[PDB]
Amino acid sequence: SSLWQYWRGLSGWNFYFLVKFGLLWAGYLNFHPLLNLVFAAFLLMPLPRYSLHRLRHWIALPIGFALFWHDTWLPGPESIMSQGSQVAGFSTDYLIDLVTRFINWQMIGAIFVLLVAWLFLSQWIRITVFVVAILLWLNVLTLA
Amino acid sequence: SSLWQYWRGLSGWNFYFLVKFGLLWAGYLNFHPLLNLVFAAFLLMPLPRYSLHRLRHWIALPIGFALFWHDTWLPGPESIMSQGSQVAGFSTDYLIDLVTRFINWQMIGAIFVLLVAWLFLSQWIRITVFVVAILLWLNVLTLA
Amino acid sequence: SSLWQYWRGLSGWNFYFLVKFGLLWAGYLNFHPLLNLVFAAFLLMPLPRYSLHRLRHWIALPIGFALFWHDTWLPGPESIMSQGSQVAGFSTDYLIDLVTRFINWQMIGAIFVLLVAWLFLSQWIRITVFVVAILLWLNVLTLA
Amino acid sequence: MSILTRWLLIPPVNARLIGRYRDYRRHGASAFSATLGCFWMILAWIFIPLEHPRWQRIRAEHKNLYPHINASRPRPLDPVRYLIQTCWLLIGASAFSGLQNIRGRYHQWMNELPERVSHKTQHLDELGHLSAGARRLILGIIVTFSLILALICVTQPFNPLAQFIFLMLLWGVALIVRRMPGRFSALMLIVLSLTVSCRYIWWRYTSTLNWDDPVSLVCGLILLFAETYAWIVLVLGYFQVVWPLNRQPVPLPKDMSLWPSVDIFVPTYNEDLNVVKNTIYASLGIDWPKDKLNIWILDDGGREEFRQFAQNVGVKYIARTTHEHAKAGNINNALKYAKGEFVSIFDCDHVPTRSFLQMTMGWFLKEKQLAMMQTPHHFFSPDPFERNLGRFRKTPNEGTLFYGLVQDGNDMWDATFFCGSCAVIRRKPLDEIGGIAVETVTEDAHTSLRLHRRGYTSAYMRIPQAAGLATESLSAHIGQRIRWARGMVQIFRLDNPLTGKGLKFAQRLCYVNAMFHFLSGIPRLIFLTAPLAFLLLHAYIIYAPALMIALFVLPHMIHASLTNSKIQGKYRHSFWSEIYETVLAWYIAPPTLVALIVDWVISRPYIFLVLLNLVGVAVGIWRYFYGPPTEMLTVVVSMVWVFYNLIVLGGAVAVSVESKQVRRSHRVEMTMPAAIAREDGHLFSCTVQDFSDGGLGIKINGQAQILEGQKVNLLLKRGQQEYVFPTQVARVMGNEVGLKLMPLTTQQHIDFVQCTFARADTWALWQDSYPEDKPLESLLDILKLGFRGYRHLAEFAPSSVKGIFRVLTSLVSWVVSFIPRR
Amino acid sequence: PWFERLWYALANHPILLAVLAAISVILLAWVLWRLLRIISRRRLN
Ligand SMILES: Nc1nc2c(ncn2[C@@H]2O[C@@H]3COP(=O)(O)O[C@H]4[C@@H](O)[C@H](n5cnc6c(=O)[nH]c(N)nc65)O[C@@H]4COP(=O)(O)O[C@H]3[C@H]2O)c(=O)[nH]1
Ligand SMILES: Nc1nc2c(ncn2[C@@H]2O[C@@H]3COP(=O)(O)O[C@H]4[C@@H](O)[C@H](n5cnc6c(=O)[nH]c(N)nc65)O[C@@H]4COP(=O)(O)O[C@H]3[C@H]2O)c(=O)[nH]1
């Protein structure tokens, strides 16, 4: 088109990238700057029809889920598929204890306040520019 | 009298020049600044007819492809023509595995992100001007 | 009586003079400030008659070719007159190879780039003024 | 100039450039300015593709996106402005319909959740229905538990991060419960703000009082006592307006035989008849039987004009030879001859409405010990804070908050004090209390207190049923406020409400809280000059890191502002109460202090304070680089404090611009239906914009055919009756038609005032047109108010400071030229 | 030192304290609502 008014912004995925930034800052992340940048480019790619925009978001949801899983320190799918039967056969007390040790209430509080702050800022300030600037800064630092 | 409209830029080959400048900046390319500024002069040199302009770009497509191929360290296609029989004598599965191994996805990711960056920054930065500026600077460096 | 309307600048010979400048920087020419400045003065003379302008074009073109040739370090007319019988029998491939060896493609690339530069700068900046000024500077320098 | 360009540029492009330069010069640009502008234009076309359709659209909308950049007049440093604005535009945020619909549905669900909860709790009411002793014990133990939790919430030591998180969570609580209609949410926010303010005051009293210098200790105590006073006043005000009663008018008996007789006193000392006329014409229209009403006119001037007026309009006139005790004496003298069961004092300017004496007289027959029922005061004329600031029907009057919410709240505790006029007092209790109070200057509050001490209750009605002329000068408004202050002070010095018998403690609290606003000058002055204790002298008044102050003081201010904006919603715009206080807080303070132990008069203190604060900001700019990098944020906080003080003082100066006023009759801008008829049988409608005492205003739809010498009969329709009065075309300037009303006889004036002024429906739609109280809308508005005040002072100050204010205002405007705009 | 004991039990506990404060705020608003409604009815009638 003449002006390509298909650069609407990251919209919701601002929270996705802010959560990734926070988890990298806390030190729990094996961050992948190149894949994060390519994901941002896929989210921001201009598309003419709104149908293709919606389809792009729908296809990006599972890829974003997989990328976030890959960027954490949790074990891979092979261990999960090999130990699912053992977990099912384990007693309820051990599962409950593991669940309790898995959840950190401080992390939940930080994530919730981040979501509230993101709601306010998106109501005021465009976040996509900042998110992409931070991604570019991380990639430049890493490659240099 | 819209005579200026015969000097439009190389929008459509700005991606060509940005990709080549990046590939040089990573050291994967054997560069010739004089040839590149000759190609830029060809692109920015007008033709009397819009039909003639389309013919210019149709002629330049083989030329641009050949320049991108030869600027890379790939062996000459004459060797490929001579040894096509030997390649066909080799196993096809090994060739498929090798060509799957060869493709670097990091450069492809950088290329995709650069494409998106060009398609967005063609509003606030004119890219023919900057491409020719960097090209002139590289030519000056290779002259002195 | 509107003689000032015929001062359109050096016009088509600006490219010729810039070609001579580029050659002189490259040193492939022995410049004759007297003879070339005489040619410049000959072109300088404004004549209102357009048919006489075409006649002056028809006179300057051989004059221009003669000046360009005689400003070269190429062998004089005596040598070619003596050796025409021997040279004419030889294949043109050797002649073109010798021409390419003597004058490299760097000069033709610079000529293409300078043609584009002159064409675009002859739509923003009065080129004749600068060309005449630099020609006068060259004659003055060669005088001292 | 053209020769050089032609020597440099080809005639086509040279002609283009010369045309552009001439276009620049035609708009008043200088040679240097236009030259630099052309250089910037050529560079910008070099770099930015202005031929791209995006940039065609951006240039087409160059006015909106760059309001502070004039395209036709280039100026030095324009690229800086362009860069700042473009950086903000990239920073700023510009299928939204679905998101808006979802957000609106969410807002509606949140608003209606209390409604559904109330319906569920009401149909299943079954809250006090247990046994008495168990109920009392349960309430006591539950209150003690709640207070213990509040105490642990108040005094808990917290580090930066913890304190910040607590702040955020409680502010979210306040934001969520703010958008909750009802009267319970007000109680929730009052309790929450009380807990937060107790936390802040405890922090100040227990961790941040500096004991290291005998110089930074006395000042710290002064500031902490100012804040303690502010908190005490806020708590008492919360108690005052905790739950407005929303009292409803009582329908009178259907028969007209048991109704009483009402005596209406209109006192006058120096007012002209041109204001009393409308009041007595609307009084004759009071929807009361004519055999049980007595409208009185009392004249301290001994004027015969009021005698003739009363005789020819059918009302009573009485004048006295000896004038003692001013309004109190005149009203008592009138009461001596008033043979009626009720006395209703109306001001000399507050126009009564037809449905007044029946919308407020039912309670006098239901409650058999009632003695006073006050009615709200609504000013149609611009008050001195509206006319001078261009804030007519955009910012409410000072008394809007009071007369809309505070006295309705006082009705709960039975402390609604007589407000000067516009109220009904039963004469049987009035005879017992001796009449109108004559001792002090505020007779009204003293009389109400004397009524209350005898056990007789008091009432209040919310519907605006009295419109009057607002104050016509800032000096006279200051005089009115200072008279209120002096009268309350005299009341306290002569009769303390707190120490008495027969009064509930709530009445004493309301009485004293009504008298904590007239001692609120000293805290205002202390706050204004408080930052001039670290920037000018070197004293750490608040011995704490600058982050902690911004984390304890800030919740107090934010929660107080949010709660007050919720409770006093469409009554008082934020940060304007501070402006009113500082306007008053130089002249009300000296009388109270004596009791305890442009303009060369009105605006000298503002000049003093602005000079001192400017010295402070200069010294603070000094300390920002010479100060150690540790003691850096303290200077930043104190500079923000001084900037707030400067905005305050600029607003105070702005209020004092007595503008031109030649309209003899104040215009009430309301929409009412009217019609015009010529000598042809065809009736033309008209759109009425405003009226006045001796005029009108109509905008004809089409402006068919009229002149300045033709006769047009004006038809005014009320209910189902059509009224004809002679009118003359006064102004003809297109779609605006001017009309002037000639003097009339009695009945014509009665009908006209009933048709235009005394309509008991206009003020409701007026209140419906009040803009919502919005902090951000206030921000730029108050900043512009302060800037206008500073500019006006720079215009009308002494020369030796005229230069100072001139250069300062020039710098301020120059900087604001760079600040981005949306 | 018991007050210090409870403080240290909640020095790093601002969230539980905030929630308990909200609970007490609701309870106090409720009791104030009860008393104010009773007084309002006793006054108006
Ligand atoms: N000669 C005359 N013209 C009348 C009369 N009534 C209305 N107009 C015209 O209609 C405009 C009314 O402006 P506004 O909406 O009251 O808004 C007014 C008002 O807010 C203020 N203003 C101007 N003149 C006066 C004045 O004499 N008294 C007051 N109180 N405000 C004024 O400035 C605004 C602009 O007014 P203008 O520029 O004067 O423009 C005036 C004027 O051209 C009238 O009785 N006599
Ligand atoms: N609502 C309304 N009433 C109108 C209009 N034109 C005339 N009148 C009425 O006729 C009276 C005479 O106004 P004037 O002859 O224009 O003579 C006017 C005029 O010279 C001046 N004036 C008053 N208001 C304005 C104003 O807003 N702008 C200007 N420029 N002059 C005004 O003061 C004189 C006295 O005017 P007022 O005291 O207002 O008394 C006005 C007013 O009652 C109109 O357009 N709208």
Author numbering:
A (entry chain D), B (entry chain C), C (entry chain G): 12 to 155
D (entry chain A): 1 to 94, 105 to 136, 140 to 610, 631 to 855
E (entry chain B): 26 to 70
Sentences reproduced from the published study:
Indeed, using local refinement to resolve the more dynamically associated pEtN-transferase, we show here that BcsANTD adopts an amphipathic fold and recruits three copies of the BcsG pEtN-transferase whose transmembrane N-terminal domains are tightly packed between BcsATMD and the sixth BcsB protomer of the crown, whereas the C-terminal catalytic BcsG modules remain unresolved in the structures. The BcsA N-terminus folds into a W-shaped series of amphipathic α–helices whose connecting loops coordinate the BcsG protomers via conserved amino acid motifs in an otherwise weakly conserved primary structure. Consistent with our earlier but indirect BACTH results, we reveal here that the E. coli-like BcsA synthases have evolved a specific N-terminal amphipathic domain, whose W-shaped fold recruits three copies of the BcsG pEtN-transferase. On the other side of the β-barrel, an intercalated c-di-GMP dimer is found coordinated between the arginines from the canonical R696RxxR motif in the N-proximal PilZ domain linker, the active site gating loop is unstructured, and the active site is substrate-accessible.
Bacterial cellulosic polymers constitute a prevalent class of biofilm matrix exopolysaccharides that are synthesized by several types of bacterial cellulose secretion (Bcs) systems, which include conserved cyclic diguanylate (c-di-GMP)-dependent cellulose synthase modules together with diverse accessory subunits. In E. coli, the biogenesis of phosphoethanolamine (pEtN)-modified cellulose relies on the BcsRQABEFG macrocomplex, encompassing inner-membrane and cytosolic subunits, and an outer membrane porin, BcsC. Here we present cryo-EM structures of the E. coli Bcs macrocomplex positioning all seven BcsRQABEFG partners and multiple c-di-GMP-binding sites.
